Design a protein around this ligand. Structure first.
Ligand SMILES: O=C1COc2ccc(/C=C3\c4ccccc4COc4cc(F)ccc43)cc2N1
Length: 236
């Protein structure tokens, strides 16, 4: 299970870099689209997930895109900079000045904080790989998926997989700590989507530009989300 996840990790992606809000947001949107490809490529080979109906795989991916991009961001941020900065790309690294010019300073701070958690925890690559899959399996539609049961067994197997990876008392505490971090991610992710949705909606007036693959994902996602019909699963 776990050895496979270690092999399948994604490739380096460049953002392709005046530091105006419009420019940074547009660059972030552009980075997210390229990353989206890596996400699809990664998800495709995931054990269990690949046997799921295709429509189901896509639905899961669209729902969890922001969350996946974020978790991956903390991890790059953790490894490359000891969580000092937000390491979006080798060519796009934020500091407090960048967060400010970005116009997303507080959201960025929350993200950095999640990142700091990785250091406090000393998150292993083994823990990180599992949690990522779990994030991909965290938000479902209200009426569910085409094969809800199938999704359910695999989500459960994966939770069990994470518990294996984490004395008994300490292990249980770690499992609590990681599951809690996943919940906290969702709170932050929800805020990012709200902001992303608004800029998307107010795109022409704002001058913030989104890539085509992303435009497709967002247009579809926004009604079901703001409507409260995306069922995000919470551990605690
Ligand atoms: O116009 C907007 C406003 O809302 C957003 C909100 C969020 C993002 C994308 C982020 C972003 C920005 C701040 C904190 C976490 C994240 C999620 O991690 C990412 C990882 C990437 F590889 C590339 C872009 C992002 C983009 C937009 N676009």
């Amino acid at each position: 299970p776990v050895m496979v996840l270690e092999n399948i990790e994604p490739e380096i992606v460049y953002a392709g870099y005046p530091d105006t809000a419009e420019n940074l947001l547009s660059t972030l949107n552009r980075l997210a689209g390229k990353q989206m490809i890596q996400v699809v490529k990664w998800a495709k080979v995931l054990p269990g997930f690949k046997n799921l109906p295709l429509e189901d795989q896509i639905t899961l991916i669209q729902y969890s895109w922001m969350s996946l991009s974020s978790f991956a961001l903390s991890w790059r941020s953790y490894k490359h900079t000891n969580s000092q900065f937000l390491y979006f790309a080798p060519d796009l690294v934020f500091n407090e000045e960048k967060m400010h010019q970005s116009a997303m300073y507080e959201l960025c701070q929350g993200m950095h904080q999640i990142s700091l958690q990785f250091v406090r925890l000393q998150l292993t690559f083994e823990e990180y790989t599992i949690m990522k899959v779990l994030l991909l399996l965290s938000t479902i539609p209200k009426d569910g998926l085409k094969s809800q049961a199938a999704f359910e067994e695999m989500r459960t197997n994966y939770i069990k997989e994470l518990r294996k990876m984490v004395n008994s008392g300490q292990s249980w505490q770690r499992f609590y700590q990681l599951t809690k971090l996943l919940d906290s991610m969702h709170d932050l992710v929800s805020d990012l989507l709200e902001f992303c949705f608004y800029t998307f909606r107010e795109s022409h007036a704002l001058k913030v530009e989104f890539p085509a693959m992303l435009v497709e994902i967002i247009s579809d996602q926004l009604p079901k989300v703001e409507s409260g019909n995306a069922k995000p699963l919470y551990f605690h």
